[PDB]
Amino acid sequence: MVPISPIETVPVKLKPGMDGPKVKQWPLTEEKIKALVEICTEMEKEGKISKIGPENPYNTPVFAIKKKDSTKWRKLVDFRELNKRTQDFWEVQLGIPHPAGLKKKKSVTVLDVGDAYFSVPLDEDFRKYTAFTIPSINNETPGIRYQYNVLPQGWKGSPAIFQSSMTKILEPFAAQNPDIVIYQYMDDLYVGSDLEIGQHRTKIEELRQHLLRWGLTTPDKKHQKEPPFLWMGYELHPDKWTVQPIVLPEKDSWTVNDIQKLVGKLNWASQIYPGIKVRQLSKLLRGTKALTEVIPLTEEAELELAENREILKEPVHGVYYDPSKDLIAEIQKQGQGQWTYQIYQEPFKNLKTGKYARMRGAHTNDVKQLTEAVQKITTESIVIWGKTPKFKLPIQKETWETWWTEYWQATWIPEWEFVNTPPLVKLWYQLEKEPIVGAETFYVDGAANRETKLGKAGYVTNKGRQKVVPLTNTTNQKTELQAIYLALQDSGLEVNIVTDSQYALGIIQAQPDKSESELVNQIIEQLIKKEKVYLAWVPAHKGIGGNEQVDKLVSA
Partner 1 sequence: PIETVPVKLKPGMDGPKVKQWPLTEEKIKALVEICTEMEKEGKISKIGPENPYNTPVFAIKKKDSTKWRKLVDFRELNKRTQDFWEVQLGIPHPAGLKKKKSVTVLDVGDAYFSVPLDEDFRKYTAFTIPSINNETPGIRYQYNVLPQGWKGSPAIFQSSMTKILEPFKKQNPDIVIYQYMDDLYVGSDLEIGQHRTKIEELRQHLLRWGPPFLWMGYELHPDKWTVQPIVLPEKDSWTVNDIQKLVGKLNWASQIYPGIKVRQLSKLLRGTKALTEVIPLTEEAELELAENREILKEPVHGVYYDPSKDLIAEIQKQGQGQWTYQIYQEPFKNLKTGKYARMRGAHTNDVKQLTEAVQKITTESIVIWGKTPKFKLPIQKETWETWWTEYWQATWIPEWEFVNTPPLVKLWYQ
Ligand X SMILES: Cc1cc(C#N)cc(C)c1Oc1nc(NC2CCN(Cc3ccc(C(N)=O)cc3)CC2)ncc1-c1ccncc1
Residues that bind Mg ion (CB under 5 A): 445, 540, 551
Nearer to partner 1, 138 or 176 (CB): 176
- Scan residues 446-475 and list those touching partner 1 (CB under 8 A): 460-462, 464
Find the part of the chain contacting partner 1 (CB under 8 A) among 95-103, 253-261, 472-480, 518-526: 95-103
160 binds partner 1 (CB under 8 A): yes
- Nearest CA among 74, 77, 70 for reference residue 32: 74
Q: How far is the CB of 501 from ligand X (least distance, A)?
A: 57
- Scan residues 91-120 and list those touching ligand X (CB under 6 A): 97, 102-103, 105, 107-108
Q: How far is the CB of 509 from partner 1 (least distance, A)?
A: 4
Q: How far is the CB of 116 from ligand X (least distance, A)?
A: 18
- Scan residues 503-542 and list those touching partner 1 (CB under 8 A): 505-506, 509-510, 534, 536-539, 542
268 binds ligand X (CB under 6 A): no
Residue 322 annotated in ligand binding: no
Residues 6+ apart with CB under 8 A from 151: 117, 118, 120, 122, 157, 158, 161, 162
Look at residue 89 and give the partner it binds from ligand X, partner 1, Mg ion, none, a contact being a CB closer than 5 to 8 Å depending on partner kind. Answer: partner 1
- Scan residues 298-327 and list those touching ligand X (CB under 6 A): 320
Interface pick for ligand X out of 160, 181, 256, 316 (rule CB under 6 A): 181
418 binds ligand X (CB under 6 A): no
441 binds partner 1 (CB under 8 A): yes
Cα–Cα distance, 438 to 432 (Å, whole number): 14
176 binds partner 1 (CB under 8 A): no
Residue 457's CB: how many other CB atoms inside 10 A? Answer: 28
C-alpha angle 248-249-252 in degrees, rounded to nearest 5: 130
Residues 6+ apart with CB under 8 A from 508: 431, 484, 523, 535
Interface pick for partner 1 out of 92, 197, 303, 493 (rule CB under 8 A): 92
Q: How far is the CB of 437 from partner 1 (least distance, A)?
A: 5
Tell me if 454 sits within 8 A of 475, measured CB to CB.
Answer: no
Residues 6+ apart with CB under 8 A from 296: none
Interface pick for partner 1 out of 109, 371, 474, 501 (rule CB under 8 A): 371
Q: How far is the CB of 190 from partner 1 (least distance, A)?
A: 11
Cα–Cα distance, 175 to 183 (Å, whole number): 13
DSSP state of 327: -
Cα–Cα distance, 263 to 253 (Å, whole number): 16
Nearer to partner 1, 174 or 284 (CB): 174
Tell me if 215 sits within 8 A of 119, measured CB to CB.
Answer: yes
Look at residue 227 and give the partner it binds from Mg ion, ligand X, partner 1, none, a contact being a CB closer than 5 to 8 Å depending on partner kind. Answer: ligand X
Residues 6+ apart with CB under 8 A from 20: 14, 57, 58, 82, 85, 128, 129
Find the part of the chain contacting partner 1 (CB under 8 A) among 217-225, 273-281, 371-379, 448-456: 371-379
Side-chain-side CA neighbours of residue 549 (13 Å): 14
Element (H, E) at 282: helix 279-282
Residue 355 is which amino acid?
A: K
Residue 194 annotated in ligand binding: no
Residue 513 annotated in ligand binding: no
Q: Measured between alpha carbons, how far is residue 131 from residues 18, 43, 155 in Å?
A: 16, 14, 12
Strand partners, 377: none
Residues near ligand X (CB under 6 A) are 97, 102-103, 105, 107-108, 181-183, 190, 192, 227, 229, 231, 236, 238, 320
Q: Which residues are annotated as a binding site?
A: 112, 187-188, 445, 480, 500, 551
Q: Which residues are annotated as a binding site for Mg(2+)?
A: 112, 187-188, 445, 480, 500, 551
